[PDB]
Design a protein around this ligand. Sequence first.
Ligand SMILES: CC[C@@H]1C(=O)N(C)c2cnc(Nc3ccc(C(=O)NC4CCN(C)CC4)cc3OC)nc2N1C1CCCC1
Ligand SMILES: [Zn+2]
Length: 294
Amino acid sequence: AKEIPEVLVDPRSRRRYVRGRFLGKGGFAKCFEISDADTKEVFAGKIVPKSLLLKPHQREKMSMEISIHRSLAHQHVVGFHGFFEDNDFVFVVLELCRRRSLLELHKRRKALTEPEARYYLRQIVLGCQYLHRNRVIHRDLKLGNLFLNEDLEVKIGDFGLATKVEYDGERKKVLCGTPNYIAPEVLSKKGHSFEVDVWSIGCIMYTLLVGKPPFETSCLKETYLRIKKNEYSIPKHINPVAASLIQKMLQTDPTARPTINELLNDEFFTSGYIPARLPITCLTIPPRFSIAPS
Ligand SMILES: CC[C@@H]1C(=O)N(C)c2cnc(Nc3ccc(C(=O)NC4CCN(C)CC4)cc3OC)nc2N1C1CCCC1
Ligand SMILES: [Zn+2]
């Protein structure tokens, strides 16, 4: 049956982690709060049984995720704190993000206020700017892997579909996985690069401001059809400045979209209010951003 250890030992680093509260599954992984027995620090452990990694192609995908994520360090990227293995499991040690993800926020709040959307989108963009400048395309940016720490700071996570651009002008021809907010050039199998991440942020912005994703249908294949045909509409109550930026990012032609470095210079950010921080209450109650308290 094979059972997960209660204490996880890294023989190289000599660090031991006591397995705590179950957090949920993430793909092939069962995830847990894990705490270092010496420093008492808490991390999110991702635990993958090798019995699900029998195919070299699976191991290579798991290897590449680790290889990419371990190379990154940024305020808006999930912290990578180690990985190790025994004969039965791969153990990955990640930054624990105690407020889960924007997916759980979205399920509770639906459409956010515009300043909340600017706030989160700014941090998503800063993290993605960092990725692209280090030649990493994430390829799976979605509400569920945009994690939130205690301070409601965004941490981009789940590098399971990410890839490294190895040379200038390289077009990736293959994406082995099913991303949520999939760019049309991936779907049409015509070669893709960094612009797919800007498509996805486009979709995240729409979802954050509208309360639902732009191309949703009752069948994934019908969704793909719509994406390829660029069949979406922005509700009339969305402000023209926001709607303009969504439109720019959601263009069929990847070369037409803004690049990650242009986004924060958009009128959407520069001429609107961006809170310095959000109160914890924003997880459940719309903020009014009032100037003083009564
Ligand atoms: C490690 C994988 C991925 C990741 O990459 N990081 C960095 C991550 C960082 N932080 C967290 N944090 C929490 C995630 C879930 C919960 C939570 O409360 N889960 C409840 C458990 C019982 N269940 C009935 C209802 C859900 C609490 C978290 O922090 C206190 N999760 C992360 N995940 C997730 C772990 C499962 C899917 C993805
Ligand atoms: Zn494959």
